């Protein structure tokens, strides 16, 4: 979870 | 109004159309917000959503991903396009739903992965996912990043920083660099990303800018080359495009400049 990051368009 | 994207002829793949190559059988991920599949312009073979609470990949509720769709399809009409939804309305996505897609589209034996996004921070999840999405000859294109420049360090996003990753960064239709495209020693080549005339969900057209913009026509033009030469590796595809972009300025800033479909596909 502290290791999923987030992607943007 | 009905809009295509200027871009289509400045990497040259009316050259391609014309010689009958408009992309059939080629299968396209494209990993966004989805794809309004009811716009009477777009064609969509197929897709999946790995947005937990958007399960639907055949609606939009951002307008990037059906924005992608047409950019794709602009370049090779014939394509399958795939609606791999990884992102939600708000236009982010978590690096594990990414993950899902790419996945997703290999067991699905796509043949082009276009990812119009990016992230800050890096991730060993994500980059096995696209290495091993290369390693099984899927051609893997993804936006640069819209970060412009930081003297002499690099501005590429993940997972377009990644080596396996085509990094795609933005020109104008002067083959001027725009401001906001992102720089640095993984960005591979550039394509039209300034004001790209496609499709909006509600039957709409818009045009919109980024690199995002840019790595939609290289994913198109890979479905081309694959089109013309179906046995050709993801290694091949790459190498053509690579090899024989138009040199623009200095590879930090440019890579190997724009690319030039008609001479990747000879």
Known sequence: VEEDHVAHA | ???????????????????????????????????????????????????????????????????????????????????????????????????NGIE????????????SLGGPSGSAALKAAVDKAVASGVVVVAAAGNNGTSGSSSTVDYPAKYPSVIAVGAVDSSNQRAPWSSVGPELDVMAPGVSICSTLPGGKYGARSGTCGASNHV????????????????????????????????????????????????
């Open chain 2, 104 to 115: 997703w589209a290999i067991a699905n034996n796509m043949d082009v992965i276009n990812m």
């Open chain 2, 219 to 266: 994913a198109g033009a890979a479905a081309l080359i694959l089109s013309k030469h179906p046995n050709w590796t993801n290694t091949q595809v790459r190498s053509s495009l690579e090899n024989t972009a138009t040199k623009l300025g200095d590879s930090f800033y440019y890579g190997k400049g724009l690319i030039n479909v008609e001479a990747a596909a000879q």
């Open chain 2, 1 to 99: 109004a009905k809009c295509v994207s200027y871009g289509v002829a400045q990497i040259k793949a009316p050259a391609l159309h014309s010689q009958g190559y408009t992309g059939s059988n080629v299968k396209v991920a494209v990993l966004d917000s989805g794809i309004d599949s009811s716009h009477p312009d777009l064609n969509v073979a197929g897709g999946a959503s790995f947005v937990p609470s958007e399960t639907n990949p055949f609606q939009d509720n951002n307008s990037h991903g059906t924005h992608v769709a047409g950019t794709v399809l602009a370049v090779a009409p014939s394509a399958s396009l795939y609606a791999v939804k990884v992102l939600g309305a708000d236009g982010s996505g978590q690096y594990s739903w990414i993950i």
